[PDB]
Amino acid sequence: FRHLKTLYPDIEFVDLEEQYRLSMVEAKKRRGKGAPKKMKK
Amino acid sequence: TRPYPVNVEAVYYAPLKLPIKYGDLVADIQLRSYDNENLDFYSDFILRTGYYLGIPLTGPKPLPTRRERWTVIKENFERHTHKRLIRAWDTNPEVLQMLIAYITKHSMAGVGMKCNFFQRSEISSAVGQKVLELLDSPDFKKHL
Amino acid sequence: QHYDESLLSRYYPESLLKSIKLAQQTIPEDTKFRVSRNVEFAPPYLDDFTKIHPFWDYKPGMPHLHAQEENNNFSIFRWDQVQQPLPGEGNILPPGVSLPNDGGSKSADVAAGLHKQTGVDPDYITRKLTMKPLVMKRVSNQTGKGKIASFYALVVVGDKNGMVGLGEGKSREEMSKAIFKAHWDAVRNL
Amino acid sequence: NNKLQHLNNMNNWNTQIYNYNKNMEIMNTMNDKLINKLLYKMMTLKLNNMNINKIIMSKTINQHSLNKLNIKFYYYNNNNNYYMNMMNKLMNIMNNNMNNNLCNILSYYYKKKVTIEPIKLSYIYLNSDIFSKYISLDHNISMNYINNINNINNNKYNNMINLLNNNNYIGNINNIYNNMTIDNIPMDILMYKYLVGWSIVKLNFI
Amino acid sequence: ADLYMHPEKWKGLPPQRILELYWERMARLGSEYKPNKDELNALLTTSEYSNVPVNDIKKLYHRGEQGAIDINSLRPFMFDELPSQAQELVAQHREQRFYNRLAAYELPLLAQYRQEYKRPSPESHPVTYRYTSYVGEEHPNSRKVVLSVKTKELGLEEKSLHKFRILARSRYDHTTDIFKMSSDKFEHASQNARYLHDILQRLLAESKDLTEDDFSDVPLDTRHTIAKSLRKKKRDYEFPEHWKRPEDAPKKKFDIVDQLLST
Amino acid sequence: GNFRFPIKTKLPPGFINARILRDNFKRQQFKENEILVKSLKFIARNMNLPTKLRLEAQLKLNALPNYMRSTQIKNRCVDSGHARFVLSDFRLCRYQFRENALKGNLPGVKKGI
RNA sequence: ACUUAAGCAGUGGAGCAUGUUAUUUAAUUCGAUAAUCCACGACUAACCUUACCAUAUUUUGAAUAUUAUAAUAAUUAUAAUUAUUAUAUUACAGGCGUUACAUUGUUGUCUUUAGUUCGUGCUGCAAAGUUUUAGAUUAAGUUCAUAAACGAACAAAACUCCAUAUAUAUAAUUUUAAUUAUAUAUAAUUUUAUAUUAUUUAUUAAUAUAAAGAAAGGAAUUAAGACAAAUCAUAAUGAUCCUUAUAAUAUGGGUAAUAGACGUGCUAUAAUAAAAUGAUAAUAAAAUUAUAUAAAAUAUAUUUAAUUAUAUUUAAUUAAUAA
Numbered sequence A: 001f002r003h004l005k006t007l008y009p010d011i012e013f014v015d016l017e018e019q020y021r022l023s024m025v026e027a028k029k030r031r032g033k034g035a036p037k038k039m040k041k
Numbered sequence B: 001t002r003p004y005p006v007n008v009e010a011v012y013y014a015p016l017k018l019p020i021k022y023g024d025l026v027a028d029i030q031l032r033s034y035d036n037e038n039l040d041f042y043s044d045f046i047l048r049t050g051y052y053l054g055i056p057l058t059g060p061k062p063l064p065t066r067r068e069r070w071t072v073i074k075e076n077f078e079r080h081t082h083k084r085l086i087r088a089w090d091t092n093p094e095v096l097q098m099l100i101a102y103i104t105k106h107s108m109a110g111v112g113m114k115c116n117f118f119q120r121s122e123i124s125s126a127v128g129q130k131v132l133e134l135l136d137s138p139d140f141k142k143h144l
Numbered sequence C: 001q002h003y004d005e006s007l008l009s010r011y012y013p014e015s016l017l018k019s020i021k022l023a024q025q026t027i028p029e030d031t032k033f034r035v036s037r038n039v040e041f042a043p044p045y046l047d048d049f050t051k052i053h054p055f056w057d058y059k060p061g062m063p064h065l066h067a068q069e070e071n072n073n074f075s076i077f078r079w080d081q082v083q084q085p086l087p088g089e090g091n092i093l094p095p096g097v098s099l100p101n102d103g104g105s106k107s108a109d110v111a112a113g114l115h116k117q118t119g120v121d122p123d124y125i126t127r128k129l130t131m132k133p134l135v136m137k138r139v140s141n142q143t144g145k146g147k148i149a150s151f152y153a154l155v156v157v158g159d160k161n162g163m164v165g166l167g168e169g170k171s172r173e174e175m176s177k178a179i180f181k182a183h184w185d186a187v188r189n190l
Numbered sequence D: 001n002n003k004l005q006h007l008n009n010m011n012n013w014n015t016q017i018y019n020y021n022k023n024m025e026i027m028n029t030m031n032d033k034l035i036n037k038l039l040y041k042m043m044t045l046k047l048n049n050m051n052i053n054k055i056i057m058s059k060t061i062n063q064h065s066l067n068k069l070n071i072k073f074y075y076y077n078n079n080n081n082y083y084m085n086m087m088n089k090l091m092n093i094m095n096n097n098m099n100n101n102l103c104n105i106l107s108y109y110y111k112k113k114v115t116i117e118p119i120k121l122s123y124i125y126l127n128s129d130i131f132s133k134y135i136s137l138d139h140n141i142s143m144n145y146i147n148n149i150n151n152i153n154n155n156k157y158n159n160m161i162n163l164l165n166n167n168n169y170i171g172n173i174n175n176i177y178n179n180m181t182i183d184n185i186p187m188d189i190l191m192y193k194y195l196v197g198w199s200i201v202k203l204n205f206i
Numbered sequence E: 001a002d003l004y005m006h007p008e009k010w011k012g013l014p015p016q017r018i019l020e021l022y023w024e025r026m027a028r029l030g031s032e033y034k035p036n037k038d039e040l041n042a043l044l045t046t047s048e049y050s051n052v053p054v055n056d057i058k059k060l061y062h063r064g065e066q067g068a069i070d071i072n073s074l075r076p077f078m079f080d081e082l083p084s085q086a087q088e089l090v091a092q093h094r095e096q097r098f099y100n101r102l103a104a105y106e107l108p109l110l111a112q113y114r115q116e117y118k119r120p121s122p123e124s125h126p127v128t129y130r131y132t133s134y135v136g137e138e139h140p141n142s143r144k145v146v147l148s149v150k151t152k153e154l155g156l157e158e159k160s161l162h163k164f165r166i167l168a169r170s171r172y173d174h175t176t177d178i179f180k181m182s183s184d185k186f187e188h189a190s191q192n193a194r195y196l197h198d199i200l201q202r203l204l205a206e207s208k209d210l211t212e213d214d215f216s217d218v219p220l221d222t223r224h225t226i227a228k229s230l231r232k233k234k235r236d237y238e239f240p241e242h243w244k245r246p247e248d249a250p251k252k253k254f255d256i257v258d259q260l261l262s263t
Numbered sequence F: 001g002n003f004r005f006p007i008k009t010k011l012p013p014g015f016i017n018a019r020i021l022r023d024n025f026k027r028q029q030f031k032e033n034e035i036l037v038k039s040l041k042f043i044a045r046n047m048n049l050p051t052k053l054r055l056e057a058q059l060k061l062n063a064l065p066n067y068m069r070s071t072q073i074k075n076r077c078v079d080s081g082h083a084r085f086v087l088s089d090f091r092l093c094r095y096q097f098r099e100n101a102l103k104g105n106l107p108g109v110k111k112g113i
Numbered sequence G: 001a002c003u004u005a006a007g008c009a010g011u012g013g014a015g016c017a018u019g020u021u022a023u024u025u026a027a028u029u030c031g032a033u034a035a036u037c038c039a040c041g042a043c044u045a046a047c048c049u050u051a052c053c054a055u056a057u058u059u060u061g062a063a064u065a066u067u068a069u070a071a072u073a074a075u076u077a078u079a080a081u082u083a084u085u086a087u088a089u090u091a092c093a094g095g096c097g098u099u100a101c102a103u104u105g106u107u108g109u110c111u112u113u114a115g116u117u118c119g120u121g122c123u124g125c126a127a128a129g130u131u132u133u134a135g136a137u138u139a140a141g142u143u144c145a146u147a148a149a150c151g152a153a154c155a156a157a158a159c160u161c162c163a164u165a166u167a168u169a170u171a172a173u174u175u176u177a178a179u180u181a182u183a184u185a186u187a188a189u190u191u192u193a194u195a196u197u198a199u200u201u202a203u204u205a206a207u208a209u210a211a212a213g214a215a216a217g218g219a220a221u222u223a224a225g226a227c228a229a230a231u232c233a234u235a236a237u238g239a240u241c242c243u244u245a246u247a248a249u250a251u252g253g254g255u256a257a258u259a260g261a262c263g264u265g266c267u268a269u270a271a272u273a274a275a276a277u278g279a280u281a282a283u284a285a286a287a288u289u290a291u292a293u294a295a296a297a298u299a300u301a302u303u304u305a306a307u308u309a310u311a312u313u314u315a316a317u318u319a320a321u322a323a
């Protein structure tokens, strides 16, 4: 799916699974249940 | 009523087969598929193609069906490989090439082929390379 | 059998003519044809295959398994509609349809069913009779699994000129069906 | 014995293939699965925002021939002359684009020629898979069918006995099939024509 | 026929033709599609054919779906379509008709490429090569070649033939008198054919050589053939000759009907 | 830093988990190092050659990393990543094999009669 | 009426194999516990598998997207743009973490499935009932009878598919097993004629005799309840928890330790039973061989040979052909 934007610029493809994952991250983001920031080396 | 020539009539009947004159076996065509309807239809088409190409073809000899079985722990699953055989006799290699190319052009789904060609004719090392290189290398040549 | 060239020329396209010539010289005239048994290569009907039927034959330009068109010569560029429309009338209706709006109220149904079942005149029922519901209630029955509710309707119908009838109807599903049954019974009890 | 009155047992399987090289057959099955999932992912199309069309398509039928692959699938969608909507662009990139159409990339993927065949279904209850994916977001007929089949059989019988009363080759083909024709035989003999039952997903067609 | 690619030639065409060419160019070009002057001017003429105002077609051309937006579920069944399964059956019949037409009107055109079978004269063409071709597959066994020859037709005298058979070892079968060799080591089948032919020339050359060769006193070994035959069932027996009694055979009976029908 | 394994290996095209990734790494590295390992084994197992070369070959064989060994490759389900009850005819565990056979994804498979 | 009681055939005290439990262990990865009994998945655990222990060791990691610097190309014109490929970039990815963290999906176990609704008709003022019948028959829903009840839909049955017996086609009987192979088709739920005994008494069952029969077995296919589940390894989604650690890689170890305890199998405890031998080779079926199989031969155990096990060497076969 990553390759599609390069191949077919006119057509705009929505991958539903990534939208669901992003919305779930936002939902956990809203309630402060987000993952702790990864330690910088 | 409406004239219907011989070609259209031949479609509505079993494929015509040319007689074998000499008896030389030039090509064996084995068709195998997991279902039989497509298999027999394609065999019939090959027979018609061979007839119109002038190729004596014996016919689709039924060969033993292979049965693969699997057990899921107790459900039984199985796959049947149906196999047909068509043999070609007394014709030139070029005509076999035309037959095979044409029937490959118009093949049917789910059917696989093997073509064995008999050509009567007149009487008249990657690992090894690597082993030599290692033996030349200065980790093995240093032990001579 | 064998036909002379002109007779086929008038009755067949020119391109197919050369195929028919080669078939004529290829198939002996004394040929005997035996029907096949295991595999039916030909259609059940009779056809000379000269013309392409839009429904029963692969559409020209449509990609498919046996597409003989060059891969980039397909002529299907608008995908909005169903590509191959239905043949014949354009419809697939069963021998008798029964859809009054898609085939290719209480008073009306009461009148029709009553004329069908007892011979009563529909027009008299629809025009002259008037219904007023008298009793409308919910009655329950206990059962081992649970309590089951039903709707009871008692209605009175009459033409206001000396004919009056009483009808009772029960329905577990809806009160409207109970009123329908009560109207039916009241018409029967005139 | 007739292809208008039965469904080929080959059509039962989504990937219909036989290869002498069994490893290539397994590879083709895996490729069919993965490409089917990718085709599933490509079926949603939005134009800017608030224009999210979702095409529901059944599972793909991968017809493997010796010199070609055909990916057949059914799909549901939903002044039109002078522009292109998202679904039309999707199909045109499936087959019609000159430069980087999908079937060329799939041909490089499979190492054999590839074509894609989308077919539109104007309703949702004409396919169990499409119907299920969408909702995620008769005795007279039989009597007529049997009697009419008997009519065709008896008509061929009548033609043959008449031809006999006027090897096993009998006579001209036209007299054998005097009245049988494209208009009357095909549509009448076809099966699975009407939906006679359903249970929301199992659709019974007879 | 190159109408769609060059913008210059839409003028004067039937309206449906301009519309189809417009669709063709746009669909084929895809992302590389760009507006053109002549296509728009030709599309201006198509306003009469269909129910569209001129400015409306300009707008639709300019801005796609959204320009048109700025300007169903569980629907009743109209009996205008088939189920998917019935459509599969119709596809089967479409394939059947395609093949029927093909056999009807193209296969008769393959007779022009007929050629007579010049039989390779049996004695002077005794070596048969088997090549295998798995059509439409990359099968490693496509490289195997089999060279088989009935040893009698080899041009050899008794001592040379006996040497040939002795040196063949397991590759020679005394019962069927066949010498068969299989080669699949090289990548292609032609390389294996050359390999087999060269080995045959070596074997023949040194079998024909009897100058310093004394393999007459070595009996031919058949233990491999003995085992191969021992791994098969035999139906050698036959009905005893003396047991046959032709006297009791069915005797055909006279029937005058066919006599008069034929004479 | 960027990748768990010493050498860059492309991602499998289907279901992914850690054990599938390790399996794929070992498989690809076996592909690359097969010829070298076979040559080393030949030099080690060839009694014609001097003993010193045989011992050198054996020591070099022992020095190789684990992702080059042939035995360490284990067949895993390509749909769930399970390593047991894997059918090599489809490279699926018995459960995934069952579901795919019921759904018709496997060509030619049917229910037993 | 499951299950029991009876009859028959066994197995059953020992050794080993293989599980579970206990105990130990650094770990001996995971499984049950509301009082009969039950923690018990193995289509192969040396490494991998692997999930456990020890020691080191990796930190945007496996993906998606953002925002930036480097090379590659394509164009325009060194620059502009596009892409690709790296390096960062942080949302995060990841988790064989948790069922005392829940709900669907299902996976099974048990019961009921000639029965449940719907439509009419009829009885009762009505809630309701649908009646004889709480019938007969069979080994059993397999079959009848009656009566204000009669219908349609599912379900069941029929039907379907195996097996069997035949017919047609196909095979130039060297891919030979034509005694075979696989396509189509037919056939049966057996049909009859009498005798005797019962019978709702014949236009019925029990048998038995005679006649035509190749005809004698089998599987699948539906819903409704109710219980059990996290090796629910039969999954998904969500809840919560870790984010230098409960994530990830490598080396080795462990899953095989034994006082014991109980299951499951294999080998035995001798003569209605074990051993040796039995080459023109007594007699099969179903499988498997491109990530192979390994024939015959030579050599060593070893000894005239044979047998058996390895070694050397690959003959054919990628297959109705050879193994």
Ligand SMILES: [Mg+2]
Residues within 6 Å of the ligand: F071, F073, F074
């Ligand atoms: Mg292993």
Ligand SMILES: [Mg+2]
Residues within 6 Å of the ligand: none
């Ligand atoms: Mg380890």
Ligand SMILES: [Mg+2]
Residues within 6 Å of the ligand: none
């Ligand atoms: Mg281990």
Ligand SMILES: [Mg+2]
Residues within 6 Å of the ligand: none
């Ligand atoms: Mg997570």
Ligand SMILES: [Mg+2]
Residues within 6 Å of the ligand: G095
């Ligand atoms: Mg873990």
